[PDB]
């Protein structure tokens, strides 16, 4: 089966594969990536590399990201024997600091010439925040861009916009690590599961190679207009740099029971056909579930903006 591995880089991306692993989350390897060794000590990571120990002699890059360039730059071997054997890998990091802004693009460069599909999905800064962390974070960003084959972007901002004044910073937190942890198990199914009309890893690259901004999207319903809901669900997060509209590529797979109607799969594929509001190229695929009754639940990649 192919292999998928999550990497964190610095302080914000291994938060995140540290909270998904306490989800818990199996059939993908961790790597926890550091310049700190405070914070990679308390990594759960089954595999974790500190950069940079002679430029930073075990600290952060102190909010430069040219010392976590070269950080990323020197330990490139360390990088490579830790990726070695993935088909896909998911970058992760926090923009605007030092490490993940310099090393996560050259982490990215290293999985995507090793032959792995390699998605980054990071955020950007708080506005509170300021300024310069905006501007450091924006040129990541486009660091990122030049490096994998798709991109997912979260503004911290837009956790302003679900949380109310009580809500807890780590419950807010949380909230975007879904975006990376529903993207990752859907994969993962989507390559575990046979599906009546199914999809393969093939399709994932077709859809996903080279091809710059994305969405990955899971959305689950039940009862009446079902197929329609889940639909919306997958392809609507508030999260979202990159929304679905003008979508040219997309991966879409259906679960459900055995009720599971050709009706409703029409109806969800053409809420995903409209919302992209493109001349699309759709890969379908179905899977009947017997275990689920009164469930469906829609996955889509949309790519190609
Ligand atoms: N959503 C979220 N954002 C974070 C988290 N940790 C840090 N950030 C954000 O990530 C940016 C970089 O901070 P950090 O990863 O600690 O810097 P680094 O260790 O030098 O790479 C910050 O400016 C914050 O916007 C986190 O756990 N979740
Ligand atoms: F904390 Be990051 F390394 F600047
Ligand atoms: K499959
Ligand atoms: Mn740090």
Same mark, same amino acid.
């Given at each position: 089966?192919?292999?998928?591995?999550?990497?964190?880089? $610095?302080?914000?991306?291994?938060?995140?594969?540290?909270? #998904?692993?306490?989800?818990?989350?199996?059939?993908?390897?961790?790597?926890?990536?550091?310049?700190?060794?405070?914070?990679?000590?308390?990594? !759960?990571?089954?595999?974790?590399?500190? @950069?940079?120990? !002679?430029?930073?002699?075990?600290?952060? =890059? *102190?909010?430069?990201?040219?010392?976590?360039?070269?950080?990323?730059?020197?330990?490139?071997?360390?990088?490579?024997?830790?990726?070695?054997?993935?088909?896909?890998?998911?970058?992760?990091?926090?923009?605007?600091?030092?490490? $993940?802004?310099? %090393? %996560?693009?050259?982490?990215?460069?290293?999985?995507?010439? #090793? /032959?792995?599909?390699?998605?980054?999905?990071?955020?950007?800064?708080?506005?509170?925040? $300021?300024?310069?962390?905006?501007?450091?974070?924006?040129? /990541?960003?486009?660091?990122?861009?030049?490096?994998?084959?798709?991109?997912?972007?979260?503004?911290?901002?837009?956790?302003?916009? @679900?949380?109310?004044?009580?809500?807890?910073? #780590?419950?807010?937190?949380?909230?975007?690590?879904?975006?990376?942890?529903?993207?990752?198990?859907?994969?993962?199914?989507?390559? =575990?599961?046979?599906?009546?009309?199914?999809?393969?890893?093939?399709?994932? !690259?077709?859809?996903?190679?080279?091809?710059?901004? =994305?969405?990955?999207? @899971?959305?689950?319903?039940?009862?009446?207009?079902?197929?329609?809901?889940?639909?919306?669900?997958?392809?609507?997060?508030?999260?979202?740099?990159?929304?679905?509209?003008?979508?040219?590529?997309?991966?879409?797979?259906?679960?459900?029971?055995?009720?599971?109607?050709?009706?409703?799969?029409?109806?969800?594929?053409? &809420?995903?056909?409209?919302?992209?509001?493109?001349?699309?190229? #759709?890969?379908? *695929?179905?899977? &009947?579930?017997?275990?689920?009754?009164?469930? @469906?639940?829609?996955?889509?990649?949309?790519? *190609?903006?």
């Amino acid at each position: 089966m192919a292999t998928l591995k999550v990497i964190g880089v $610095g302080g914000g991306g291994n938060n995140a594969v540290n909270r #998904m692993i306490d989800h818990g989350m199996n059939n993908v390897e961790f790597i926890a990536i550091n310049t700190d060794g405070q914070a990679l000590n308390l990594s !759960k990571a089954e595999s974790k590399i500190q @950069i940079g120990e !002679k430029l930073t002699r075990g600290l952060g =890059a *102190g909010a430069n990201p040219e010392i976590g360039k070269k950080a990323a730059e020197e330990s490139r071997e360390q990088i490579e024997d830790a990726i070695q054997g993935a088909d896909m890998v998911f970058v992760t990091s926090g923009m605007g600091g030092g490490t $993940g802004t310099g %090393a %996560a693009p050259v982490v990215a460069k290293i999985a995507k010439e #090793m /032959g792995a599909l390699t998605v980054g999905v990071v955020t950007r800064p708080f506005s509170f925040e $300021g300024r310069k962390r905006q501007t450091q974070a924006a040129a /990541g960003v486009e660091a990122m861009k030049a490096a994998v084959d798709t991109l997912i972007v979260i503004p911290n901002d837009r956790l302003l916009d @679900i949380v109310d004044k009580s809500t807890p910073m #780590m419950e807010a937190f949380k909230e975007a690590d879904n975006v990376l942890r529903q993207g990752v198990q859907g994969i993962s199914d989507l390559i =575990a599961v046979s599906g009546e009309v199914n999809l393969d890893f093939a399709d994932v !690259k077709t859809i996903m190679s080279n091809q710059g901004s =994305a969405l990955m999207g @899971i959305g689950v319903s039940s009862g009446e207009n079902r197929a329609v809901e889940a639909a919306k669900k997958a392809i609507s997060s508030p999260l979202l740099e990159t929304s679905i509209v003008g979508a040219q590529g997309v991966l879409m797979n259906i679960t459900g029971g055995e009720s599971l109607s050709l009706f409703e799969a029409q109806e969800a594929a053409d &809420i995903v056909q409209d919302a992209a509001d493109e001349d699309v190229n #759709m890969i379908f *695929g179905t899977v &009947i579930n017997p275990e689920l009754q009164d469930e @469906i639940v829609v996955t889509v990649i949309a790519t *190609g903006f």
